[PDB]
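During the second year of the project, the team shifted from modelling isolated chains to modelling whole assemblies. The rationale, set out in the original proposal, was that interfaces cannot be judged from single-chain predictions alone. As a representative example for this report, we include one of the complexes processed in the last quarter. Its constituent sequences, exactly as entered into the pipeline, are reproduced here:
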Amino acid sequence: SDSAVRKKSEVRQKTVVRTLRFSPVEDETIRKKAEDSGLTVSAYIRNAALN
Amino acid sequence: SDSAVRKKSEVRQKTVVRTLRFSPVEDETIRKKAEDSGLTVSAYIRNAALN
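Output from the structure prediction step:
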C-alpha cells in the first residue's frame, strides 16, 4: 500500500547495521584514545575511518 | 565445575561485540577506501582507528 506523492512508508536501509568485533588490545587502545579526546568510541571509530 | 589448571570454559570475552552503525555517505566512503586499499571494511575500520 503506497502512492506516488505518498511513499513515506519505507525507502532502503540508508544506514549499515553490522556486528563488529575487536581484540582486548585494539579495544584498550581505542577506549583510551576515545576518552582522552572526549569523543565516544562510536564517534572515534567513524571519525578515524573518514579522517 | 572447574579446577585451578582446568578453567578454559569461559574466562572472559576478550573480544568486544557491538553494533556500529554508519550513514550511507560514510558507508560509501568507507566502502571505497577499504576496497581501494585492498582491505575489507572491517580491517579498514580497525586499522584506521588504531593508527
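Strands of chain A lie at 16-22. Residues 30 and 36 of chain A are 10 Å apart (CA to CA).
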